[PDB]
Amino acid sequence: SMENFQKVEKIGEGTYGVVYKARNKLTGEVVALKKIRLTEGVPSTAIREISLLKELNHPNIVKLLDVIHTENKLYLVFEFLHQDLKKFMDASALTGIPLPLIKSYLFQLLQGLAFCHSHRVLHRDLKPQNLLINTEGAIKLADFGLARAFGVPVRTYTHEVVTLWYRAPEILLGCKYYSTAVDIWSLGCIFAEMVTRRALFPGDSEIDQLFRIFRTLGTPDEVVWPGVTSMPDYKPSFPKWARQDFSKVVPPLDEDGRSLLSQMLHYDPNKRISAKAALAHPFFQDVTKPVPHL
Amino acid sequence: VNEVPDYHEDIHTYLREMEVKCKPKVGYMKKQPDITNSMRAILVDWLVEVGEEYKLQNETLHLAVNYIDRFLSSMSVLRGKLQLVGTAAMLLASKFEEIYPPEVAEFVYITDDTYTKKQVLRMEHLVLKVLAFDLAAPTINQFLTQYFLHQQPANCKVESLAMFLGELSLIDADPYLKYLPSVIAAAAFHLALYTVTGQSWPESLVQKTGYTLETLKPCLLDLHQTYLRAPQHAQQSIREKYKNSKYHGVSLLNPPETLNV
Ligand SMILES: CN1CC[C@H](c2c(O)cc(O)c3c(=O)cc(-c4ccccc4Cl)oc23)[C@@H](O)C1
């Protein structure tokens, strides 16, 4: 089963299990082996991750090659990607990421995310540790451990969902329903983070996180967001901060960039831009596919 | 955005393609030496009680029945094990679909200790191997909820009646295994719309689906009968369930005598 594979290096670990870099002895292909943690049978995170990744086949989504199910181990075999966007941003702390590469990566992330949403899948955990890059200029969505298949229209799903810093306001405010818009919020926070090299809303509790969002975009009312003051966790005592101009939120960013960023971060999920629509934004008029500069 | 305007058409096209790949063998029951359409009906009725008892989503029940029919399309099973297959399918569907699935121990309790926890867990593993982890199947519900967005205006009794008719179709392999989920759902929607309001399968749903009253006619005839005889059926757990006010007491409405079709 694992007889064809030679382990090369342990490259990550967490609640999920552990990942190794490995080599197929007969074909030469370099793979990632994600060994899943094993109570209550096969975990639901792995059932969902496997069944959805088998349906999703796209150049900006990680490719599941095989599943090895020993009855005592569970390994997912993936095509290998060398580094995550978090580690790349930290390694580019000295003078930052060039604008052509920022454009290429965001363009690719939107293709991949549009493909998920066209196939009725929400990711629900987009952030730089879960976005992987290679030596040829590609970037891909990874870690589908939190993903879920959705119906049309959606019903109520799990409330404890996105990592806090990247979590949309409709989740923070305890709405009954959420949809594809939560993944767009996260990508908007990631876009800012690639331009500046630090998180846009780094809160330390749910309430701190809301107040940080309000201090940048302004406290929402009934005019900018119909129904906001009727939501389960909306407090009338919330402070009324003024909306900041967007040139002050991300100073180095040109006019097109700012327009796209603002549509990604719109308060009302119904007005927030779709991934599919964002690919046509003028910010991408001159987009290429450069390789990473490091 | 809860109705995903920029994606519902892509999603519909995809579910249509997937329902053909996830389809059971139509003739599987004839090739099972020890089981029958009648034993399968007892099993599905039992899973409806289990779903009502643990407050499971209807989608969970539909997926479980999909996993069971695909498993039995490839594996021969003795009568004394059919319940073990069903219990593992219901556990897997719960894990896939529910926010809070019951624990493995709660699934051993409802089999009346016919089986062990070790047997339930092994069977879970065997079902995953046989279906190769393809668990994101299209169901009658995934289509029904999309069709509902075409009511003018939305009517709550139409919706719950259609759910009820679709759910009755899961019990009887003959005839319903020969119809795709999207077709059973079109039939169930028309019949519910006509029974409650007197309107018919609309034009906007002809543009979306390609289905006309003409193409839906065979399934609609089978479904009309099932509705008429439903108070006479040996299995009644679906009727008990749709008395409840959560489903607007729709199992109390009276079926129409003819369709004019
Ligand atoms: C917490 N998350 C992180 C992503 C991780 C994951 C995948 O889901 C799928 C994959 O194909 C890979 C991969 O090919 C390489 C790496 C990796 C690279 C550099 C450094 C560390 C790692 Cl782990 O991760 C992958 C995911 O399963 C776990």
Author numbering:
A (entry chain A): 0 to 37, 41 to 296
B (entry chain B): 172 to 432
What did the authors write?
Members of the cyclin-dependent protein kinase (CDK) family have diverse cellular roles that include regulation of the cell cycle and transcription and, in certain cell types, differentiation (Lim and Kaldis, 2013, Malumbres, 2014, Morgan, 2007). CDKs share a conserved protein kinase domain that comprises a smaller N-terminal lobe linked through a hinge to a larger C-terminal fold (Endicott et al., 2012). All CDKs require binding to a cognate cyclin partner to remould the kinase fold from an inactive conformation to one capable of phospho-transfer. We have used biophysical measurements and X-ray crystallography to investigate the ATP-competitive inhibitor binding properties of cyclin-free and cyclin-bound CDK1 and CDK2.
Reflecting its pan-CDK inhibition profile, Alvocidib is equipotent toward CDK1-cyclin B and CDK2-cyclin A. A comparison of the binding modes of each of these three inhibitors to CDK1-cyclin B-Cks2 and to CDK2-cyclin A reveals that each inhibitor exploits very similar interaction networks to bind to both complexes, consistent with their comparable binding affinities measured by ITC. A relative displacement of the C helix in the CDK1-cyclin B-Cks2 complexes compared with CDK2-cyclin A is consistent with that reported previously (Martin et al., 2017, Brown et al., 2015), being far smaller than the displacement that accompanies cyclin binding and accommodated without affecting contacts made to the inhibitors described here. Our structural data show that cyclin-bound CDK1 and CDK2 form the two conserved hydrophobic spines. In total, these elements form 133 and 145 inter-lobe contacts (<4.0 Å) for CDK1-cyclin B and CDK2-cyclin A, respectively.
